[PDB]
């Protein structure tokens, strides 16, 4: 069930104006599921609604999260995978043990009580992010507000090597038509190989494997006159299933740009509220599983990185949920 991934992509694309969008739904759902373990009442119900987890118990959500992390960390030793979680809370505050223990058990959360006023705390948190993303996301926070209570942070890291790599000697300078209609000159990689391929009325689809073929990249290339906005707006489990099950091994002459993108989002502003999460961002939020203090979510910061090149792909994401009094 990738409904959350597609709904998060669609809602993000609707509310941001940049040419590139790049998100990790896995990272966002892990950080919010750790937080959901402390929520009660409507606070919890609205978080389950936004996560597309309505109808599941916390026991099932936590067991699924744990089994998913275990599967992804061991399915391909030839691919580098990181899935790390941490909880940083205000020194001297009482944080409930059942909440800490659930997050240590199902998310392998590293839990730390910290002095948020120390000059060492922001570099300890940002340094943790750098450590868990091969230094590709070096900062998740620029500042800590005076009413900070807790940070729940997830970091996903991926470094895969293509099953069939490109040769840098075959990369050539070539035009790429931007979304804004202007053309730019790029480093266009090229190779002729067997890849997974399929088509429909809008697009061409390619599947490019990494390592032992457990992980892959799917590329959706709209036909002339067709748009990525329409692809995004039409994506759902049914359409995704149609693509995946339609893929067949095909001899393909591939031209792909070497590209990098780094994105940053404040998911609390418009995106998570549109997906149904409203009360948790207000003073009416209730998190009795975390503390007796009245706290709420002030920010949900999501940062991502991706580099695609001749050898493979390196991608990283960090999601930090900021809770304040």
């Amino acid at each position: 069930d990738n409904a959350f991934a597609f709904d998060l992509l669609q809602t993000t694309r609707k509310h941001v104006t940049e040419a590139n969008v790049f998100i990790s739904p896995l990272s966002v759902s892990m950080a919010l599921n750790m937080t959901l373990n402390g929520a009660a009442g409507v606070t919890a119900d609205e978080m389950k609604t936004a996560l597309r987890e309505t109808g599941y118990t916390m026991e099932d959500i936590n067991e699924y999260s744990h089994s998913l992390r275990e599967a992804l960390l061991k399915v391909d030793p030839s691919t580098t995978i990181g899935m790390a979680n941490s909880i940083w809370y205000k020194q001297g505050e009482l944080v409930k043990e059942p909440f800490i223990l659930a997050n240590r058990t199902h998310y392998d959360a590293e839990v730390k009580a910290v002095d948020f006023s120390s000059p060492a705390t922001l570099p300890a948190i940002n340094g943790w992010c750098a450590q868990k993303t091969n230094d590709k996301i070096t900062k998740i926070l620029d500042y800590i507000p005076g009413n900070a209570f807790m940070y729940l942070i997830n970091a996903v890291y991926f470094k895969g090597i293509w099953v069939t790599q490109f040769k840098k000697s075959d990369t050539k300078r070539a035009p790429f038509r931007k979304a804004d209609g202007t053309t730019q000159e790029v480093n266009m990689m090229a190779q002729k190989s067997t890849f997974g391929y399929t088509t429909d009325e809008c697009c061409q689809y390619l599947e490019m494997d990494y390592g032992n073929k457990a992980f892959s990249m799917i590329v959706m290339l709209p036909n002339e006159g067709q748009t990525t906005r329409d692809v995004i707006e039409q994506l759902d489990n049914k359409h995704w299933s149609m693509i995946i099950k339609g893929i067949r091994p095909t001899q393909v002459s591939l031209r792909m740009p070497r590209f990098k993108t780094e994105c940053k989002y404040g998911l609390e502003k418009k995106i998570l509220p549109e997906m149904g999460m409203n009360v948790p961002f207000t003073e009416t939020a209730d998190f009795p599983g975390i503390t007796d203090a009245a706290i709420f979510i002030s920010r949900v910061i999501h940062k991502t990185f991706v580099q695609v090149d001749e050898e493979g792909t390196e991608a990283a994401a960090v999601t930090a949920v900021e809770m304040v009094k």
Binding site: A5, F22, F176, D180, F215, T261
Partner: protein, 36 residues
């Protein structure tokens, strides 16, 4: 043996990184501008 299909990414595209056994989408996005 078969004549290859041309798959030339010279315009915006959507892409995703997935894992097959779980079916999970780890990353997904849209590229409208190539950066280095």
């Amino acid at each position: 043996s078969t004549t290859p299909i041309n798959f030339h990414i010279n315009k915006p595209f959507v892409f995703a990184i997935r894992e097959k056994s779980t079916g999970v989408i780890l990353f997904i996005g849209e590229i409208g501008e190539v950066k280095e």
